[PDB]
Amino acid sequence: SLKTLPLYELHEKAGAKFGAFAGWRMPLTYPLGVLKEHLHTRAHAGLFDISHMKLIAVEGPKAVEFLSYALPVDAALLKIGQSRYSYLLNERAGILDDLILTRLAECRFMLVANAGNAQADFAELEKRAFGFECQVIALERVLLALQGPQAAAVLADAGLPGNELLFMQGFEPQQDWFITRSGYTGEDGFEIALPIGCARALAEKLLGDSRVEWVGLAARDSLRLEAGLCLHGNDITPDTTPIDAALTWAVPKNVREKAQFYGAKAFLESLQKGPSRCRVGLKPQTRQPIRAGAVLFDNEGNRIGVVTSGGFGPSFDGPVAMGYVPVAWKVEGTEVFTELRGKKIALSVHSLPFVEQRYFK
Ligand code: NA
């Protein structure tokens, strides 16, 4: 009943330890281990099987107009090859999913959807497309991320194109292949989407490079959390608007002013009213991590918020977390508290990212 990765056997051969995520059986860690896999990515090149994510193609003569209604983007202004972070909003401007949109041609675009939301995102995009002369197509693909300071060199030595991309650009080097210079680590890196029948060979070719190791979901999580990146279902949900989540930067002024996207009225009203709670970085004042779901209190014991993500960051060399506090507590350095074994434990509100980003310039 958990979904199976196309490359499951490679993970089994690599000695992966498996667990459930977003309805898939995923490698959580390998024998290298959560700490060294994390550190490996920041020093070398980590290979991540992210085939649980979903590519959705959007194609047809009115793809541009459809996209500018479905999402808060000006799809006509996106240059061919350019990627943008965006989100599918509901009528109340809650975030159904966060997405990356890439223009591939005048009438062709690609979306990458999160694993847990792929089916719902596809159904909702299809309904928003009812009026438009465009098609929305869920693709069957393997998706690999190759991340770290050596990733570009590994890519070149494997004979794959992409070193010419800038950060947040993408292209199609072969029919049914899609490569982007992007990721979820705060490092330089790439994502490669390709047909399922071509994938095992590619993954074995990249792993064969002495700079490359497989990285599991645990380390994927510590990396992204150090980088200050949101995880939908933890840090953003259909109950959090981009205003609460401090993600309004993703919607440029011209798009706000045109207000043609689904959710625009609620988005604009939320922007005027201000946030109902605020996504913040949190630094536990302890060597032991505070985990997702930890309740946050003020200095008098009143419940004020919650930790949405938390773990040990090996690069930061201590616990890192993110969560929600009311606007009054969002100032950098503000003390908030949680309870552990009946003792009050302090966290301070902390800038994000925790670790400096090293995207290609
Ligand atoms: Na290797």
Side-chain angles (χ1 to χ4, degrees), residues 1-12 14-90 92-163 165-252 254-272 274-361:
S1 186
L2 291 176
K3 294 166 183 166
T4 297
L5 290 166
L7 301 181
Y8 171 80
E9 287 177 22
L10 294 186
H11 302 300
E12 215 279 331
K17 299 79 190 74
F18 297 91
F21 179 71
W24 293 76
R25 175 170 293 97
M26 299 296 285
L28 304 185
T29 186
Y30 294 87
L32 181 54
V34 70
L35 302 174
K36 288 177 178 162
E37 287 164 40
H38 180 116
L39 296 166
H40 182 89
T41 304
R42 293 224 191 282
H44 297 295
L47 188 63
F48 305 71
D49 187 349
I50 56 171
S51 298
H52 64 320
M53 305 297 274
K54 198 72 179 184
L55 268 68
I56 294 168
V58 171
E59 178 175 11
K62 302 295 182 184
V64 169
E65 295 83 0
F66 163 56
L67 288 164
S68 308
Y69 171 67
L71 302 172
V73 303
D74 189 346
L77 299 188
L78 201 51
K79 300 172 195 152
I80 289 173
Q82 284 194 328
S83 300
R84 276 188 84 103
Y85 179 79
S86 199
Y87 23 69
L88 190 69
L89 299 181
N90 67 27
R92 299 174 315 300
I95 296 165
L96 295 167
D97 206 9
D98 59 346
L99 300 167
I100 311 294
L101 174 67
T102 302
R103 188 171 200 171
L104 289 175
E106 176 67 39
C107 297
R108 301 173 50 239
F109 294 77
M110 189 71 75
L111 285 161
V112 181
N114 283 110
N117 301 137
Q119 188 174 53
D121 292 351
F122 181 80
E124 180 66 27
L125 283 165
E126 218 174 27
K127 298 173 185 164
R128 294 180 193 191
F130 280 159
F132 294 92
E133 191 182 8
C134 182
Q135 298 302 132
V136 182
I137 309 167
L139 305 181
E140 188 162 39
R141 296 289 182 269
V142 157
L143 189 64
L144 305 171
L146 179 71
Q147 304 281 302
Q150 302 177 317
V154 169
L155 193 72
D157 291 352
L160 308 161
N163 265 265
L165 294 170
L166 305 183
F167 184 60
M168 299 292 281
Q169 290 184 347
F171 79 126
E172 300 169 293
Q174 166 64 318
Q175 184 76 32
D176 292 347
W177 281 57
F178 173 53
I179 297 180
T180 62
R181 190 166 204 153
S182 67
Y184 199 48
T185 64
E187 303 293 328
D188 188 21
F190 301 82
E191 296 188 354
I192 308 167
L194 75 172
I196 294 167
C198 295
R200 184 191 169 102
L202 175 58
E204 294 169 326
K205 176 178 193 188
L206 295 171
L207 279 159
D209 189 302
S210 67
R211 299 165 288 196
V212 181
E213 302 288 351
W214 282 120
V215 181
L217 277 197
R220 172 168 162 95
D221 199 55
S222 53
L223 293 157
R224 71 91 188 176
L225 180 47
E226 283 185 345
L229 310 174
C230 289
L231 169 67
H232 194 280
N234 278 39
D235 316 301
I236 50 179
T237 74
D239 292 318
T240 60
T241 72
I243 300 65
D244 306 326
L247 295 178
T248 60
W249 56 258
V251 187
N254 85 286
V255 176
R256 294 181 202 189
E257 289 180 346
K258 266 183 285 211
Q260 67 180 105
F261 58 94
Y262 195 101
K265 171 173 177 169
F267 182 98
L268 291 176
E269 278 160 3
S270 188
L271 217 45
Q272 273 288 131
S276 71
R277 39 177 182 162
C278 300
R279 183 177 62 84
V280 300
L282 295 163
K283 182 186 173 170
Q285 296 183 11
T286 166
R287 282 150 187 74
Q288 299 308 311
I290 297 176
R291 309 300 295 272
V295 177
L296 295 175
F297 301 91
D298 70 8
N299 65 350
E300 299 193 326
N302 307 122
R303 189 199 158 125
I304 60 167
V306 68
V307 174
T308 55
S309 297
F312 185 80
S315 306
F316 189 64
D317 197 28
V320 300
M322 286 191 327
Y324 284 85
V325 297
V327 67
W329 279 264
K330 85 165 168 184
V331 174
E332 191 174 341
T334 299
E335 299 181 330
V336 300
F337 306 85
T338 197
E339 285 290 307
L340 174 64
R341 306 180 293 270
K343 285 203 178 159
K344 190 172 104 144
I345 288 339
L347 302 83
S348 59
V349 168
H350 194 283
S351 61
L352 294 170
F354 290 99
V355 171
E356 200 190 342
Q357 296 168 342
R358 297 188 275 285
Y359 301 130
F360 183 67
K361 296 197 287 206

